[PDB]
């Protein structure tokens, strides 16, 4: 716990406190715009809203924000710690809101511990938000707040902690009945636990068609029957059962077709599973520890379908399936609330998507797709790119038929086109790489073993279990620096040290290097010096001999001093005559790759075509459809310099060698990234949307552009420089490489080594 | 009004509604970070705040936001129109907050029309904000709200609409007494008007040292004396005077040393000024129309000092002097409120800055500096870059001595260094250009007169009075397109049309062109064709003949087809042998210029040195200190390609020819923009901070980098491409030029033509 | 070691040698060590090149 505690504490404490910030979306540097954006001109918009209140959407940005409001009464599993102490959780919830759907979130921690004032303040804050996600609140005051607001608010009010997880649970049950081959009106549902995210689920399931008399509710006290306490509170009498001696979970665990558990860990015992019914449908939503372990249920009864809230098992009940996309559906039409119709229109799109998987470009073999509608796959993945095109139009149509939509949409196809254009610019492709690497770690040698960044990265890799590292350097220096940095990695146990000043394999290593380079200017004495003073050579020989599977080098020195060694020892991949390096950037238009940043100073047309094909294949392996643009200062033949002609010839060669690849050129960068400019210049261009692969005419342009964009349009680091064309898994980094970049590159190298490391 | 109404309505209605947006400041695309940013890891930060509540500043971003809260009871001069209808004004106020100081603003329009619930909701919203700027609220409920909050809030509460303008008024009076040579305890102050931004000013002036019995208050009723109404409300009895027959403004206008007017236009008459005292000190803060016209006061009495709230006169009382910087001072220390000490510590820094002007790099002769402490200059300019270094440390020191500061600062010099680093990246240099151009418009010919963008720009230029335009094209097409676009410009009155198909000056024009180009491959017949089919040639001959002062061309066609004409007709400036083009970008590090984007395909070392010197001089004329970086894929001699050696030679030449210029190289782009990387590589580099001029080795790198940065790191448009080295004021644009870019370039050309157009 | 590699870096900082590269050179390149020794006056001459 201490290591994880320190990692989380330092996750955002040192560089900048917090996890979100407020940023403007429009520019302001001039005069005569203040005369219009302020008092002299701002009077005209105001008088329009006064005459037409409905015109507040054209001249303002009112309806796009959501409030995440808490009081800190039940902070995760920590309980009542206060509203202020719960700010990090609310901030992280807003982060998840923004990262998965693109929802602006204001996180508020009201200090009120009384309900009445809670509704007072939330109703006062009405004009600020288009929807209020109540979070970290006890019961049953939340229901009262939501009902009073919805009957007093002309704007959407949606407690997500109830209704969103209700939707996710309901969709996992409607599709589960298909697999178990049972009817909704004949199944028996048993629930052990009452709380905030249980009553909404029960209401949704009852409105789905399930009989109320077939539902049994419980808590820590036992079966919630009639005649248990003199003062038995509400939200428990509408679902209570008559007293027939039933008092515990096991009394109703027999014959239960569905078991929706949302309270308490370690509740279901092996005997209860043994005495359960056939084809169990267990929904153990408990996050810190589920009600029943999915490995434990599938052992005693292999016919059980388990839909947990954890990230370690499939069919994950994560609210990131609910609060991003359900709120996005509610907002995009401008509702007045999510009634049962919208709650069902959203629950049916999720279920339809879960049983209509059709591949459509995935991360090659990187990871584990296994997308087949069955027991192990009942709901869409937490960050499915398609869950904005299926939910938002569905909710908009439901609102149009329900009378709560204020501004109807006429042409839906344009709407889906706009939403898919929006979702094309988000792709978290490093998670499957990390998962695949964790599935089977490989041996990776790091020649710069004395570097502080490399030691930090080695600690992280050992903690995550991504690879088995081998460090080259002086043992005394490495141990002293590990102690100075306060790391927990130990030589020999966590990682292996190769002493470059002394090793029993010195003779074999330098003899092999001499045999490689004897007719390339290297004498035996020079080989002996190289196997002592050049760790890259040691690592390359190690890889070639099969004592390691991959190598990450280049954090010290110049790129070509490592690349020359790599090329000499490994050589090119079969059928390849050139190599290139690709760097990745996250721009507003999406993930963007820049090709040949480090290898070739001035490639010719054939080299450019080979680089383009390799880059397209590599990007395809990430799960991204390649869209290539050949860049030049000439815009579609406007210049006749030899560089532009070379780009045109490379385009012809690429078209000859790969007719299925999306590519155009030669063109300017803005035309490559902005579709409107390109459509103005070349209406019938084969390149659609924004290009994600930019191939440059020469080294200097590529490197200068990449450096300026990296320091200017900085939105995180994924991979780079990615080396292509070499016959072994190896990448050369740069001295400015960060710890996260090193870890990512090691994971990518492990994944490459797993599949025939050639 | 209709034209301004349409301009303001379309200012932000068509492209995107609204004027602000919410943007994150940290990246999120990976896994294993959700395990730390959320539930599994987010528990560790929460338990730390529970044990230590003061630790909420290290693990959260709590204290940086301000609420701008209104109820729409007095919207500017429109009165009571509602809270929702006042959203554009609040949004614009937040825009001004962010643009001048960098303050995050949440704009709220509460529908409550009752005070008690207003304090209820604002006190409920305490944990969201570090300060509440009450706006658009009547009196005296605001005082009650502020007092109750400050006595119930442990966080800063600062009604800016009272106290900030009180500070600005007080600073304009303390410095005014120096000019008028009078004592604060012996002056007579007369006020005609009671309102929100008058009682705070009176309180501040009384605490400054002025006697209460020397202050006279008035309203529409008249003198606020005792015994006027049976129920005379508060905030008027603490300053009322005894009844001696004084009932109107003129009864107390005699002998008044200071006249602070903040209510009503057209209040002071000529006779009142005639019967006033010597050295009048008039503060007419009325925004829509001042109490007395500054031109009217200075005529009857030339000894009067007037400090108005308008932008048409000096000594402007604009809250952009108050709410950005005073709130910044309050926030940067983490106060508990702005008491009199902070209110005075901020008012003394403003006064000290107003009478301690020392130039320190201004916009050359572009505009009107005239910074001399006198009657016409009593307060710092509304967007003075230095008003964050003088106010924030002053307020922090005042808080440290007052016991309201929670986290004291030890080393102040580091603090001022950080603040000046922050303020170095903001410079609104186009406003002085626009002002200087408006002072003396010039004749500017636009060869592409039939373009829709050019017609829109011509309409804007005529409206702003920046230049006298001359359009070249077919009159029928121009009139038909003007009618189709619905513009109000009329040929012959607003602008002059030159018909390229018929003009009585055809023979002289083509004869002059032939005389220029007879030994450069142009026959007489070719000259006759050129003076019909090439509008750029017509415009260039017009400029050379003195029938126009400048030309803006290039919105259609290729850059070099216009540049060749310009070079042939005009030639180089005396003492210059090469030309270059500079493009401007607004990056996170500040205004950034990229040199030689369009002229020279591959300049040599001497050409690069000349380009660098011209770019440095041009940037200096904008009011920006030039800091040049020579860019290459080689980092301080790491490569030996001819391009890197050329950059090194150019560096040596530049150092020889300009020893006073800040410059270094050759280096990578990231080292040029990020000081930490450069300090790591070259500790003793002469380049300090972030470079704002990037000189590129060849055309392709410059253009590709500029295009990618413009479409990716887009933060508005200022100028570009700026042509340097030509012997006449002319600029060649590109086909992708926007209307705003054309207007800006025309203004720059006018300013260049005003000063010896060579 | 520190004085030697610092002097070498001061000589070669604008010739493609970083501080880390200078530190590596003052360990793996005896010719550089001898040349710095001679330039510092701790030796009068150097004979190198047998390898
Ligand atoms: C994975 C890697 O390889 S990382 C790189 C590791 N780097 C190193 O190990 C470098 C350190 N080692 C070295 O530099 C060399 O092994 C040396 C110079 C010390 C010795 O190698 P060489 O002198 O060229 O020859 P050789 O391989 O025969 O070894 C000589 C050794 O045998 C000993 N020896 C002496 N006479 C004899 C003999 N007749 N027969 C065998 N050994 C003998 C020597 O004393 C010497 O001992 P030592 O090296 O343990 O001190
Ligand atoms: C600012 C600018 O200049 S924008 C560019 C404007 N462009 C133009 O004006 C192009 C339109 N004009 C033209 O192309 C030419 O003036 C032309 C071709 C029409 C005529 O010019 P030319 O034939 O070369 O010769 P010249 O200058 O002597 O003019 C001939 C005219 O004189 C007339 N003329 C005939 N005999 C004689 C004579 N003995 N003496 C004088 N004029 C005569 C012709 O009928 C003709 O009349 P018109 O041009 O009004 O119809
Ligand atoms: N979608 C999700 O991921 C999700 C959503 C909600 C909850 N959860 C998880 O579910 C658990 C409880 O959440 P909650 O909203 O129900 O909070 P809660 O109501 O505060 O706590 C669970 C409640 O269930 C009862 N309970 C406790 N232990 C029990 C046990 N062993 N057997 C039966 N009943 C027991 C108690 O009710 P009484 O005190 O009234 O007897 C207790 O108050 C937590 O682990 C939480 O993380 C997950
Ligand atoms: N810093 C600034 O730029 C700034 C700040 C504040 C105000 N102003 C300007 O000052 C004016 C008034 O603002 P305010 O806050 O005072 O609003 P206000 O109180 O709502 O309106 C002005 C008040 O002054 C009185 N008044 C009106 N006309 C008058 C006249 N001709 N002579 C004397 N008194 C008159 C009336 O008070 P009774 O109805 O009680 O008699 C009236 O209610 C507006 O033009 C406003 O824009 C500028
Ligand atoms: Mg929660
Ligand atoms: Mg105001």
3-class SS letters over B531-573: HHHCHHHHHHHHHHHCCCCEEEECCCCCHHHHHHHHHHHHCEC
Distance in angstroms (rounded) separating the CA atoms of residues B515 and A517: 70
Close Cβ partners of A312 (under 8 Å, ≥ 6 residues apart): none
Residue with tokens 């790969």: A658
Contact criterion met (CB below 8 Å) for A157 and A150 = yes
Q: Confirm or reject contact between B677 and chain C (CB < 8 A).
A: no
Cα A645 to chain center, whole Å?
A: 41
Between CA A600 and CA A623, with CA A692 as vertex, the angle to 5 degrees is 105
Nearest to A476 by CA among A466, A468, A484, A464: A484
| Angle at which helices B605-621 and B642-657 cross, to 10° | 50
Catalytic residue among B38, B57, B59, B572: B38
Between CA A250 and CA B38, with CA A140 as vertex, the angle to 5 degrees is 80
User: CB atoms < 10 A from the CB of B375, how many?
Assistant: 18
Distance in angstroms (rounded) separating the CA atoms of residues A185 and A189: 11
Report how many Cβ contacts below 8 Å link chain A to chain C.
Answer: 17
- Based on the residue annotation, tell me whether B275 is a catalytic residue of this protein: no
**Does the N-terminal peptide bond of residue A140 adopt cis geometry, omega within 30 degrees of 0?**
yes
Distance in angstroms (rounded) separating the CA atoms of residues A387 and A102: 13
Judging contacts by C-beta atoms under 8 Å, the chain A residues touching residue B694 are 708
State whether C14 and B681 contact (CB < 8 Å): no
Judging contacts by C-beta atoms under 8 Å, the chain C residues touching residue A529 are 28, 51
Tokens of A229: 């306490």
Q: Confirm or reject contact between C24 and chain B (CB < 8 A).
A: no
Catalytic residue among B19, B55, B93, B246: B93
DSSP letter for each residue of A120-157: HHHHHTGGG-S-EEE-S--TTHHHHHHHHHHHH-SS--
Distances (CA, A) of A52 to A46, A55, A59, A332, A588: 10, 6, 12, 22, 35
Nearest to A160 by CA among A21, A29, A331, A387: A331
Could you tell me if the CB of A505 is within 6 A of ligand 1? Answer: yes
Which chains reach chain C with 3 or more Cβ–Cβ distances below 8 angstroms?
A: A, B
Can you name the residues that pair with B586 across neighbouring β-strands?
B591
State whether A46 and B88 contact (CB < 8 Å): yes
Q: Confirm or reject contact between A557 and chain C (CB < 8 A).
A: yes
Nearest to A433 by CA among A352, A365, A375: A365
Q: Confirm or reject contact between B310 and chain A (CB < 8 A).
A: no
Instruction: Round the CA-based radius of gyration of chain B to a whole number and report it.
Output: 30
Q: How far is A136 from chain C (nearest CA, A)?
A: 52
Annotated binding site of A: 135-136, 161, 194-197, 287, 319
Residue list, ligand 2 pocket, CB within 6 Å? B 498, 500-503, 505-507, 509, 531-532, 538
Q: Confirm or reject contact between B29 and chain A (CB < 8 A).
A: yes
Q: Which residues of B150-178 are buried (b: 16+ CB within 10 A; e: fewer)?
A: beebebbbbbbbbbbbbbbbbbbbbbbbe
State the distance from the centre of ligand 4 to the C-alpha of A309, rounded, in angstroms.
Answer: 61
State the distance from the centre of ligand 5 to the C-alpha of A64, rounded, in angstroms.
Answer: 22
Q: What is the resolution of this structure in A?
A: 2.0
Q: Give the single-character DSSP code of B622.
A: T
Distance in angstroms (rounded) separating the CA atoms of residues B261 and B218: 10
Q: Give the single-character DSSP code of A721.
A: P
Contact criterion met (CB below 8 Å) for A662 and A579 = no
The residues of A annotated with a catalytic role in the active site are 38, 93
State whether B26 and A16 contact (CB < 8 Å): yes
Report the residue numbers after which chain C has a gap, meaning the C atom sits over 2.5 angstroms from the next written residue's N, or none. Answer: none
Q: Confirm or reject contact between C40 and chain A (CB < 8 A).
A: no
Nearest to A360 by CA among A313, A435, A420, A437: A420
Close Cβ partners of B282 (under 8 Å, ≥ 6 residues apart): B258, B259, B261, B268, B291, B292, B297, B304, B305, B306, B307
State the distance from the centre of ligand 3 to the C-alpha of A192, rounded, in angstroms.
Answer: 9
Residue A221 φ/ψ, nearest 5 degrees: -65, -40
Q: Confirm or reject contact between A128 and chain B (CB < 8 A).
A: yes
Contact criterion met (CB below 8 Å) for A598 and A732 = yes
Judging contacts by C-beta atoms under 8 Å, the chain A residues touching residue B703 are 633, 668
Report whether B133 belongs to an annotated binding site: no
Query: Which helix (H) or strand (E) element contains residue B92?
Result: helix B87-100
State whether B30 and A697 contact (CB < 8 Å): no
Query: Which helix (H) or strand (E) element contains residue B216?
Result: strand B215-216
Distances (CA, A) of B334 to A385, B30, B54: 42, 35, 12
Q: Which atom of ligand 1 is nearest to the CA of A502?
A: 9
Q: What's the longest Cα–Cα distance across chain B?
A: 97
State the distance from the centre of ligand 1 to the C-alpha of A497, rounded, in angstroms.
Answer: 20
Q: Give the single-character DSSP code of A573.
A: P
Contact criterion met (CB below 8 Å) for B690 and B645 = no
| Angle at which helices A160-180 and A323-333 cross, to 10° | 110
Q: Which atom of ligand 4 is nearest to the CA of B76?
A: 47
Distance in angstroms (rounded) separating the CA atoms of residues B294 and B308: 8
Could you tell me if the CB of A169 is within 6 A of ligand 3? Answer: no
HSE value, Cβ hemisphere, 13 Å, CA-based, for A530: 24
State whether A669 and B707 contact (CB < 8 Å): yes
- Based on the residue annotation, tell me whether B425 is a catalytic residue of this protein: no
State whether B682 and C16 contact (CB < 8 Å): no
Nearest to B564 by CA among B534, B609, B519: B534
Residue B317 φ/ψ, nearest 5 degrees: -90, 85
HSE value, Cβ hemisphere, 13 Å, CA-based, for B654: 31
Chain B: residue whose CA lies nearest to A587: B712
Tokens of B94: 């937040």
Contact criterion met (CB below 8 Å) for B333 and B405 = yes
State the distance from the centre of ligand 1 to the C-alpha of A502, rounded, in angstroms.
Answer: 9
Residue A144 φ/ψ, nearest 5 degrees: -60, -45
Distance in angstroms (rounded) separating the CA atoms of residues B165 and B343: 11
Distance in angstroms (rounded) separating the CA atoms of residues A642 and A646: 6
* Ligand lying nearest the CA atom of residue A499: 1
Q: Give the single-character DSSP code of C15.
A: G
Distance in angstroms (rounded) separating the CA atoms of residues A404 and A416: 21
State whether B9 and A56 contact (CB < 8 Å): no
Distances (CA, A) of A251 to A66, A133, A228, A281: 43, 37, 16, 18
User: CB atoms < 10 A from the CB of B232, how many?
Assistant: 14
Contact criterion met (CB below 8 Å) for B158 and B338 = yes
Which residue's alpha carbon is nearest to atom 35 within ligand 4? B220
Q: Is B325 exposed, middle or buried (0-12, 13-18, 19+ CB in 10 A)?
A: buried
Contact criterion met (CB below 8 Å) for B681 and B637 = no
Q: Confirm or reject contact between A407 and chain B (CB < 8 A).
A: no
Instruction: Round the CA-based radius of gyration of chain A to a whole number and report it.
Output: 30
Distance in angstroms (rounded) separating the CA atoms of residues B481 and B488: 12
E-strand stretches of A163-296: 189-190, 215-216, 258-261, 281-284
Q: How far is B507 from chain A (nearest CA, A)?
A: 33
Query: Which helix (H) or strand (E) element contains residue A105?
Result: strand A104-109
Cα B640 to chain center, whole Å?
A: 45
Distances (CA, A) of A10 to A89, B58, B297: 15, 10, 63
Could you tell me if the CB of A538 is within 6 A of ligand 1? Answer: yes
Can you name the residues that pair with A104 across neighbouring β-strands?
A65
Residue A453 φ/ψ, nearest 5 degrees: -60, -40
Q: Which of A473, A537, A557, A736 to mutate to test the interface with C (most CBs of C within 10 A)?
A: A557
Helix (H, G, I), strand (E, B) or coil at A439: helix
Distances (CA, A) of B350 to B170, B314, B381, B541: 10, 16, 10, 52
Dihedral sign, CA of B61, B63, B64, B65? Answer: positive
Which residue's alpha carbon is nearest to atom 2 within ligand 3? A285
Residue with tokens 């050295």: B279
Between CA B547 and CA B555, with CA B549 as vertex, the angle to 5 degrees is 105
Contact criterion met (CB below 8 Å) for B315 and B172 = yes
Close Cβ partners of B586 (under 8 Å, ≥ 6 residues apart): A27, A29, B592, B715, B716, B718
Close Cβ partners of A3 (under 8 Å, ≥ 6 residues apart): A463, A488
Which of C16, C20, C28 is closest, CB to CB, to A556?
C20
């Amino acid at each position: 716990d201490d290591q994880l505690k320190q990692s989380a504490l330092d996750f955002h404490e040192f560089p900048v406190p917090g996890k979100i910030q407020v940023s403007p979306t429009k520019p302001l540097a001039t005069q005569r715009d203040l005369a219009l954006a302020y008092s002299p001109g701002v009077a005209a918009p105001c008088l329009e809203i006064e005459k037409d209140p409905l015109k507040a959407y054209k001249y303002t940005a009112r309806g796009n924000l959501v409030a995440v409001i808490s009081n800190g009464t039940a902070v995760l599993g920590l309980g009542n710690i206060g509203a202020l102490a719960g700010k990090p959780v609310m901030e992280g919830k807003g982060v998840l809101f923004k990262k998965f759907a693109g929802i602006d979130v204001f996180d508020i921690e009201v200090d009120e511990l009384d309900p009445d004032k809670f509704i007072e303040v939330v109703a006062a804050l009405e004009p600020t938000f288009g929807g209020i996600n109540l979070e970290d609140i006890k019961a049953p005051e939340c229901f009262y707040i939501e009902q009073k607001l919805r009957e007093r608010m002309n704007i959407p009010v949606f407690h997500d902690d109830q209704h969103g997880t209700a939707i996710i649970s309901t969709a996992a049950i409607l599709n589960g009945l298909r697999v178990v081959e049972k009817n909704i009106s004949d199944v028996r549902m048993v629930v052990s636990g009452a709380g905030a995210a249980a009553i909404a689920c029960m209401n949704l399931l009852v409105a789905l068609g399930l009989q109320k008399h077939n539902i049994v509710v419980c808590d820590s006290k036992g079966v919630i029957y009639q005649g248990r306490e003199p003062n038995m509170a509400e939200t428990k009498a509408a679902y209570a059962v008559v007293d027939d001696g039933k008092r515990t979970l096991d009394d109703v665990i027999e014959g239960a077709d569905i078991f929706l558990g949302c309270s308490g860990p370690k509740v279901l015992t092996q005997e209860m599973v043994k005495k359960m019914a056939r084809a169990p449908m267990i929904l153990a939503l408990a996050n810190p520890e589920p009600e029943i372990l999915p490995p434990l249920a599938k052992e005693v009864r292999p016919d059980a379908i388990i839909c947990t809230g954890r990230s370690d098992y499939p069919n994950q009940v994560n609210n990131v399936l609910c609060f991003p996309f359900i709120f996005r559906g509610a907002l995009d039409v401008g509702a007045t609330a999510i009634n049962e119709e919208m709650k069902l229109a959203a629950v049916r799109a999720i279920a339809e998507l879960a049983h209509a998987e059709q591949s459509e470009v995935v991360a090659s073999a990187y990871g584990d797709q296994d997308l087949s509608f069955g027991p192990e796959y009942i709901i869409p993945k937490p960050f499915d790119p398609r869950l904005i095109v299926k939910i938002a139009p569905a909710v908009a149509k439901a609102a149009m038929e329900s009378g709560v939509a204020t501004r109807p949409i006429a042409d839906f196809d344009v709407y889906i086109d706009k939403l898919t254009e929006f979702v094309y610019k988000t792709n978290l492709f490093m998670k499957p790489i990390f998962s695949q690497a964790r599935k089977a770690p490989k041996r990776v040698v790091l020649p710069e073993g004395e570097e502080a960044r490399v030691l930090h990265a080695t600690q992280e890799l050992v903690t995550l279990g991504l690879a088995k590292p081998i460090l080259i350097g002086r043992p005394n220096v490495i141990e002293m620096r590990i102690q100075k940095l306060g790391l927990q990695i130990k030589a020999g146990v966590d990682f292996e040290i190769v002493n470059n000043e002394s090793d029993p394999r010195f003779k074999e290593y330098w003899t092999e290097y001499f045999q490689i380079m004897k007719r390339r200017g290297v004498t035996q004495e020079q080989a002996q010096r190289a196997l002592i003073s050049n760790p890259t050579v040691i690592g390359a020989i190690m890889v070639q001999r099969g004592e390691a599977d991959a190598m990450i080098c280049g954090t010290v020195g110049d790129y070509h001093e490592h690349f020359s060694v790599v090329k000499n020892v490994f050589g090119y991949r079969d059928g390849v005559h050139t190599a290139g390096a690709m760097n990745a950037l996250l721009l507003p238009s999406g993930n963007t790759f820049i090709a040949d940043t480090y290898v070739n100073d001035e490639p010719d047309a054939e080299e450019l075509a080979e680089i383009t094909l390799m880059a397209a294949e590599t990007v395809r392996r990430f799960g991204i459809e390649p869209r290539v643009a050949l860049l030049s200062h000439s815009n579609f033949g406007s210049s006749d310099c030899p560089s532009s002609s070379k780009m045109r010839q490379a385009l012809e060669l690429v078209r000859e060698r790969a007719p299925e690849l999306m590519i155009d050129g030669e063109m300017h960068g803005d035309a490559a990234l902005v579709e409107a400019i390109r459509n103005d210049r070349m209406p019938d261009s084969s390149l659609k949307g924004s290009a994600n692969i930019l191939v440059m005419p020469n080294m200097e342009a590529a490197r200068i552009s990449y450096n300026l964009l990296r320091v200017s349009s900085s939105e995180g680091v994924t991979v780079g420089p990615v080396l292509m064309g070499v016959a072994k898994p190896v990448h050369v980094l740069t001295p400015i490489a960060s710890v996260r970049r090193i870890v990512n590159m090691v994971a990518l190298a492990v994944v490459e080594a797993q599949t025939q490391p050639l």
